Amino acid sequence: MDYHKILTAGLSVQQGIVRQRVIPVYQVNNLEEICQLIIQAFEAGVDFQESADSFLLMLCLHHAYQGDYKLFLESGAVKYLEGHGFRFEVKKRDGVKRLEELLPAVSSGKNIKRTLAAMPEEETTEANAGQFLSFASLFLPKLVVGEKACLEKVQRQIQVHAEQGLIQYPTAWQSVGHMMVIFRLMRTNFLIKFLLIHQGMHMVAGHDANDAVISNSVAQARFSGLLIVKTVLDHILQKTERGVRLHPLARTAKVKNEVNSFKAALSSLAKHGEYAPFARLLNLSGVNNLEHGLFPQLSAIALGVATAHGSTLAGVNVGEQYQQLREAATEAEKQLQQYAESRELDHLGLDDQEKKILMNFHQKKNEISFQQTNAMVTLRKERLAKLT
């Protein structure tokens, strides 16, 4: 019989229903006034402890379908979410004007009623659902990293979308605390980011400006936090027309054990399907099976072999446990790649002048790449110096 079954026995389980969470959907006569009240409430700086979910669902409903309940509850995303415990019920309500009247009067929301009662119900702003969903969707790249990377990326991206004149934003939405509130709201919830991802990756044509911004952010926020998967699968586990061959820097025993464990975890992620490259954003099942430190030898070698080719990967930070191995790996890969290019140039049957000009071209290209990486390493050291 087999004995090694116990190690990986619990990785692959069946599929059941464990949550059973029920979400209400309000069907109100007027909708745009309520959406303006919700946007004004989030601009006021308050939070909803549990009841934010129905509000964001109704806002996304107004943006997408413009008030079509029968087609919304027969969609594909709602059909997907009912296979994981979500249950959407529908409630009706007459002409209301206040979110306290719309609130289901839960005693835990006493502080919510206290904050919304102090909110002045007289001021009006100028926005809609599309601007709010685009400005929330800008946070999706680099969301796993932290606050500072998110703020730097979104302050770059607003200026990019302001130069190419698609959409302008109000200046009150560029204060720091408002961005902090939207960052916390995007980090805690689940439903809003799944709706943004599904709507961004399942449109075909007929895009608006807000849909263009959402689809651009979804396309840029791919494989965020899974750099180990790209750096292993591109170089270390190299695909040939015959089959799959290992890199010659990975032919020991311990690294081979790491490769086998990595193949098991990769199959555990590939269970999912179309939503697999977004996993760290959606925090799926087999996400915790792939971490740094659980693959100590393979990670640094894979990152060194990857940063030997590309010149932009020198800016990534690792830690004080892998750096010297990374340096040894990238130097060995540089010299092996130089020898391989020289032998491959000597392979084909050509003239001497063609070989001379190709050697000159390869030498100049290697010099340019060396200078760019030498600049990038000093820029990373300057970043870590300016951090403290």
Partner RNA sequence: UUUUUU
- Return the residues of window 343-382 that contact a second copy according to CB under 8 A: 344, 351, 353-354, 357-358, 360-361, 364-365, 368
| Binds 225: which of a second copy, RNA, none (CB < 5-8 Å by kind) | RNA
Q: For RNA, how many residues bind (rule: CB under 7 A)?
A: 27
**Residue of 203, 212, 201, 192 whose CA lies nearest to 274:** 201
Opening angle at CA 25, ends 60 and 212, nearest 5: 10
Q: What is the token pair recorded at 48?
A: 């909803």
> 67 or 225: whose CB is closer to RNA?
225
The Cα-based distances of 25 to 6, 68, 94, 298 in angstroms read 45, 12, 14, 48
> 44 or 201: whose CB is closer to a second copy?
201
Minimum distance of a second copy from residue 292's CB (angstroms): 13
| Residue 233 binds to RNA (criterion: CB under 7 A) | no
> 8 or 30: whose CB is closer to RNA?
8
| Residue 291 binds to RNA (criterion: CB under 7 A) | yes
Residue 166, φ and ψ in degrees, nearest 5: -85, -65
Distance CA 307, CA 329 (A): 10
The single residue among 228, 250, 259, 302 that binds RNA, judged by CB under 7 A, is 228
3-state secondary structure of 246: strand
**Residue of 68, 70, 209, 202 whose CA lies nearest to 133:** 209
| Binds 304: which of a second copy, RNA, none (CB < 5-8 Å by kind) | none
The single residue among 316, 350, 357, 377 that binds RNA, judged by CB under 7 A, is 316
Residue 371, φ and ψ in degrees, nearest 5: -65, -35
The single residue among 151, 225, 336, 358 that binds RNA, judged by CB under 7 A, is 225
The interface with RNA within residues 196-215 (CB under 7 A) comprises none
Distance CA 298, CA 308 (A): 15
The single residue among 31, 40, 44, 86 that binds a second copy, judged by CB under 8 A, is 86
For 103, other C-beta atoms within 10 Å of its C-beta total 15
Q: Which long-range contacts (CB under 8 A, 24 or more apart) does 64-73 make?
A: 64/199, 67/31, 69/25, 69/27, 73/25
CB-based contacts of 248, cutoff 8 Å, min separation 6: 336
| Binds 384: which of a second copy, RNA, none (CB < 5-8 Å by kind) | none
| Residue 294 binds to RNA (criterion: CB under 7 A) | yes
| Residue 149 binds to RNA (criterion: CB under 7 A) | yes
| Residue 251 binds to a second copy (criterion: CB under 8 A) | yes
The interface with a second copy within residues 93-152 (CB under 8 A) comprises 107-108, 128, 146-147
> 247 or 380: whose CB is closer to RNA?
380
The single residue among 10, 95, 206, 293 that binds RNA, judged by CB under 7 A, is 293
| Residue 377 binds to RNA (criterion: CB under 7 A) | no
Residue written as tokens 């309000």?
26
| Binds 370: which of RNA, a second copy, none (CB < 5-8 Å by kind) | none
CB-based contacts of 269, cutoff 8 Å, min separation 6: 276, 279, 284, 286, 287, 289, 290
- Name the site residues for RNA (rule: CB under 7 A): 141-142, 144-146, 149, 160, 163-164, 220, 225-228, 230, 291-294, 310, 312-313, 315-319
